[model samples]
Target: GGLVIDMPALNRIHSIDSGTRLVDVDAGVSLDQLMKAALPHGLWVPVLPGTRQVTVGGAIGCDIHGKNHHSAGSFGNHVRSMELLTANGEVRHLTPAGPDSDLFWATVGGNGLTGIILRATIEMTPTETAYFIADGDVTGSLDETIAFHSDGSEANYTYSSAWFDAISKPPKLGRAAISRGSLAKLDQLPSKLQKDPLKFGTYRNKVQNLTQFYHGFLQYQFVVPTEAVEEFKSIIVDIQRSGHYSFLNVFKLFGPGNQAPLSFPIPGWNVCVDFPIKAGLHEFVTELDRRVLEFGGRLYTAKDSRTTAETFHAMYPRIDEWIRIRRSVDPDGVFASDMARRLQLL
Candidate 1:
């Protein structure tokens, strides 16, 4: 075991530049905190995951995608610059076009192997209100779901995602509920909400009751090219046939990949599901991994806990360049993690 540096001490919101729609925050400042601070100024983090507990550094380092990824790329795309503490004991300033741009991109989704992120200037999106005018529709089939998404609706909404019944078979197979929305205009709010149009609400324990329903679960997330839609459907049907049913299956459209070699999104169908950790579950997932590769798709590195080093190597085509940059920055290999050891990232 190694020492784990506590980052809470670094939690600080240095400044919020409303004119530039930018915020400078420490690595430990969570999105929830940032939202609380930025909401009053009509600025919001462009991409937010399901929960807002993620830290600014974690968002960038993981290159996390959100429901709005189809419009706004992942977190890494919004980073103006960051302060990185390299293994060489130097604090380097990094930007997308800096002389050390290689290091910047490498560190974005480097999983902290390149260095520790200290602080970052994030480009925030301007929002008119804190609420959204959302809608939900149920698709009868997988094709219908894909069609609904491809029907130019993505251009109308900033957010869109689907949750399907992955365990159902045949006619019921792939039936999904799609949720799509855009930020509510100030005038869109009813009279009751007009007085305080930007109220940020949090319901912390909404899912607490469901925690005891499962003993353990493993999440699998992957993306395949839009052309591989048929293959994506096959994977879902195969999973249904295998009977290692997943209760939670989410699907979203990704616009484009970012410069970070390990960034997950790639202008395709991104799917995430949670399967109960039963016997043979690992083997089942391994087989699915083979199908994913055959479909020219790749798993998300941040969501991976059991993928082999060989598989990871095959997944990221730009891995060689990423490794070279990582080596150049961390020559002594001072930063490391168990995942790095398992995936041979170092």
Candidate 2:
């Protein structure tokens, strides 16, 4: 074999340069690994989804977005270059300014259709520390929350995100939880903790424990504790009775000297929404947008699973151009996923 890149090995990154901050990472490297390596250096990858387990290739293909879409733009915006293994078994280094610049830009968010990304040279921002000072505020309505986030963006640069209670009625239709933060300063930390601010407790087992807990709870909800059972039941009922339309939530992560996470999505507000995929999904989103747009809010593409094709086209007008380049590079469509099919990329 000439060069069959190992995705598993590639996903394990520890750090990168700080200037242009070009990280040469294997496409298989997970966002979590990238964050672990970058956070200590006071540098962040920029855009990130909730879980840091996603792959770099996946992030580029999806062109993930964050709460700062109104400012920083999509995940693809930060990619500087990548090593692509073409369908014909040829490896080529691609970049935005390279001879094959068109192919490079298309591949940035092409969903892996163009070629197998052996590794990527991504840009990063330098930071001062790993700890962030988070603050939260409660808003009575979605409008107020969106407005607040938009306004906050003008004055704040560290991080910002909002959690919307989509279950509320119009005017009060959404209850908003807004949060902002900056990396904690050395002086702000306790003396003992300040010496090694980057030393974070590893909680790898917590993931397994959480998984088991949730599985068991879902398995025997009736037997769970009263308060826990009631809360679960309330959520279940809300989904069942709410006509099951999709909902969206937002989040922000920041602090003084805090290095943003390594994942493709980065350390910003992750806007997430979950709802039953159904007929009213579009209408509900449109109505939701009326408020969002009025508040100068925008949508995040990374977490979107059910956005309509028409809506997606409208939101990202260059999708077709990206597709054209993808077809030219990987005409056979070897790289495919349920998400690609859902988005009509196939």
Candidate 3:
């Protein structure tokens, strides 16, 4: 029988290596656990998806990105090497410079097709404390939000994300909610909480409370047309406060030490529209894009699982390269997801 790794229950191993700003950890380790472990040592993971429930291996497999991607790059950028279990059940240590460098790079964003990742050595960022110094801004229109984020880049914050009010009508098709943060210091912490810094157990309770508050707010706010903007702002404020949502992520740029945006699909607005892939989809998105073009907007490449091929090509001219890599890694097509198959990305 083969070894089965249970992701949720597995403990993560952490360490510091001088040559790389990397810390090695078990692939099954959850992000919450990784953050908890890293925080005590004044270090933190650079890119984090919205949810902390995902395993380290899953994040690397998906090449996860966040609001800071414009600056930080994806999860794969921070990875140095991984311990892989190949199809033959043999363990191999792979790195960007190792004998299996192609396999290593493939595995970084391979979506779990190449092999079973046992553990990974990922780079980390030094932090002054476990908190983030934060700010929020609510803009009137999508253009306003995009412009705000584009200009805010000069602020040099560690994290940034925007919320688009998709339900808004044309001309005001998108409303923006922006959140920005930098590493927080001890002095930034509340005086009472700073006394027992390690006892920040209220994080979970606060998250639960915020979830309920947003659920109620969304139900009522979405009912009125003019309230869409306020509702969007409330939802984003809730997420920034509780860290519970990832449905739509706007502009993200990581720290200055990361690589530039690769050949991934990225729409200026990155709106998410869920339409059935049956009849009328082509015409629907065509008109959607037509409307978007009028507003100088576009779709998000990484979030393009359900888009049509025509739309995909129009959005990402470099999709052929992704297709080439995908086919090379999954020739028999055993790794294609329903979403991938639907989009013909496989």
Candidate 4:
């Protein structure tokens, strides 16, 4: 609690260039704000996470991915350029390519250890309308779900994800529904919908009903190589056998990772699970982390809360290079956080 820079006050959207399909925005502006401004121009954030409450700077630092990650990559992949204020009090302009590219990549998914992102120019994806042409089929087993995600059909869709019942037993243990979709065309919409194809709605709902379920949750998300599907299934079975109740589960396929050293996703099967906090939960998750690491998998740094520094370092082999860049900009460690200290990012 030494000093906290409140960035929300810096929220200012400089411009939305429809012709270029690019948005220049303050790092503090939320994705929801950016979406409302872009939807009218038939341009949308290339990738969107489940919640739109994250700041552009946070998205970039985490290199957040979404359902469309199978094709679109993560949020940082779409950033054309950004302005970062380093620890030395100098504002630097950065792009994906160039002499300062290492700094750019380091800042992306660096978790703010390098500097503060002041502003960014993101390359928005073009769309005919705000609607999607969606379709799905249910899978009876974990193998079936994995097969569906890897069969190469995802190339035709902009978004793909699955939700499986992890608590089920035997033959139905991992039954899941895989959904895929692409942006809807103007002609694809019915006559009534065509009148306002890009209509936007902003809805915010607070969490309620705490009386019935008072326990908070710990969400763990990880990605393993495609070849580790069998081990992945076994890990799920271990969770089920442990008797800890997981309220939610989501699965998705990740495409190739970007240049960012600490970017979360890789070409693999990604899984996310939420478990209500209970005694021994930390030990259970640590054991799961052991199994995941053995399979050459790694947890998403953005969603992680309990991984050891050694485990985190092993997960990202390029961490040394990332640290080098961070050191170059902040030799005195002016930018830092508890997570950074715990993970030994410096």
Query: Scored by CA lDDT, what does every candidate get?
Result: 0.82, 0.55, 0.55, 0.83
TM per model? 0.92, 0.66, 0.64, 0.92
lDDT for predicted candidate 1 compared with the true structure: 0.82
Off by over 4 Å in 1: 1-3, 50-52, 201-215, 302-304
True-structure RMSD for candidate 2: 10.5
Model 2 C-alpha lDDT per residue in residues 1-346, reported as the tens digit of each score: 3445443556646348776576878888877678678767666667755466788887776666554443556667777877888987899888777698788766765666678777887887665555555555788764465456445453553545666665554666456766555556666666766677765411211211112211100000001112232332333334435565335543343211111111123222233456555676566556544333233233444434335565445445466776777677777766655666677775
Model 2 residue 282 CA deviation in Å: 9.5
Give a tens-digit lDDT track for model 1, residues 1-346: 5666665778899999878999999988998889889988889888875565788888888888888888998899999999999888899999998788888999886888989999999999997777777665788887788888888779987877888888888778888877777777787767777787667621211111101211088989988898888888888889899989988899888897888888877888888999898899999999989899888898876544778899889988999999988888888678876777788877
lDDT of 2 at 301: 44
Candidate 1 positional error at 341, Å: 1.9
CA shift at 209, candidate 4, in angstroms?
26
Give the TM-score ranking, best first.
1, 4, 2, 3
Model 2 CA deviation exceeding 4 Å by range: 1-7, 12-15, 68-71, 150-153, 201-248, 251-271, 276-315, 336-346
Q: Model 3 scores what on Cα lDDT?
A: 0.55
In model 4, the runs with Cα more than 4 Å from the true position are 5-9, 201-215, 302-304
